[PDB]
């Protein structure tokens, strides 16, 4: 159905085989999260694919996609569900040959509900 | 995977974090992320986590940890100094 | 000299315990809500808007020990006042019901929220 509000840990692996770990938080249609070198935000327009903006705050550590500016990721809705496990294929906007595979694991609901 | 410095060649069997700690002890100096990744041929994400994990194994490793200006490049980084290691 | 409700957004945090155990994480502030996590734990709290913030800490990765070496859920107390600075914060946060157990948190602002 529709993805659960709460806190998720994510694992991601790119086509250039770099991998990394982060957290992700969903609060309604708002998606936010980050890892050791970059952070991300997006809104669920709930009718399209989700555009996720990736911002680098630590350039001493390379992007798993080895992009050294801000970029956008495409996440398709089709695969999002209310399960406690999720697997996602997310490519760079305007370049399908560049991508990350995400495994999301649900940890906990949110403290103030809806 | 990782390489073992000639400094500690004869410890091949020990887990990575013991191996790193022992190497650190042999430097007798404040070690950062970049020092470790360099010497063990691993990437920086991995190097960071190793420091984090070591700092949580107090029954094995006796150390200090400061968070300090470098560069700069007006930022601070975690550095670690490893007194010694227990293998019994 | 400013109250704990300061900029909404995403923060990177570095913390060191009273026994010099450490970690790296991110933290998101959104209205009266605090959420974040690292490689081994997650945390949440409500800004009661008059008191100290109670922050609930849960470990999800049992391959890695808690930075305070606590083997169940615990709570941290985050002080009302925070004192501020330019995109930098330093916080003393002790464990609820035991003040000798604590973490020093170094937080850096990354970015506002998209909405």
TrEMBL record, chain A:
Q: Which InterPro entries match?
A: GrlR_sf
**Superkingdom, natural source:** Bacteria
Q: What is this protein called?
A: GrlR
Q: Which organism is it from?
A: Escherichia coli O157:H7
Gene (UniProt): grlR
Automatic annotation (TrEMBL), chain B:
**Top-level taxon in the UniProt lineage:** Bacteria
One BP annotation, GO: DNA-templated transcription
Please give the name of this protein: GrlA
Q: Which residues of the full protein are shown?
A: 9 to 96 of 137
């Amino acid at each position: 159905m529709i993805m659960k509000d709460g806190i998720y840990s994510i694992i991601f692996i790119s086509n250039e085989d770099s991998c990394g770990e982060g957290i992700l938080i969903k609060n309604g249609n708002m998606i936010t999260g980050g890892d050791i070198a970059s952070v991300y935000q997006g809104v669920l327009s709930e009718d399209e694919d989700i555009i996720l903006h990736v911002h680098r705050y630590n350039y001493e550590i390379p992007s798993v996609l080895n992009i050294e500016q801000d970029y956008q990721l495409v996440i398709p809705k089709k695969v999002l569900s209310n399960d406690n496990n999720l697997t996602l294929h997310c490519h760079v906007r305007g370049n399908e040959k560049l991508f990350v595979d995400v495994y999301a694991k649900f940890i906990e609901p949110l403290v103030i509900k809806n | 995977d990782y390489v073992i410095p000639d400094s500690v060649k004869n410890y091949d069997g020990e887990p990575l974090y013991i191996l790193v700690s022992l190497w650190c002890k042999l430097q007798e100096k404040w070690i950062s992320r970049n020092d470790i990744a360099e010497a063990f041929g691993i990437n920086l994400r991995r190097a960071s986590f190793i420091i984090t994990y070591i700092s949580r194994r107090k029954e094995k490793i006796s150390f200090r940890v400061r968070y300090v200006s470098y560069g700069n490049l007006h930022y601070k980084r975690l550095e670690i100094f490893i007194y010694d290691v227990n293998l019994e």
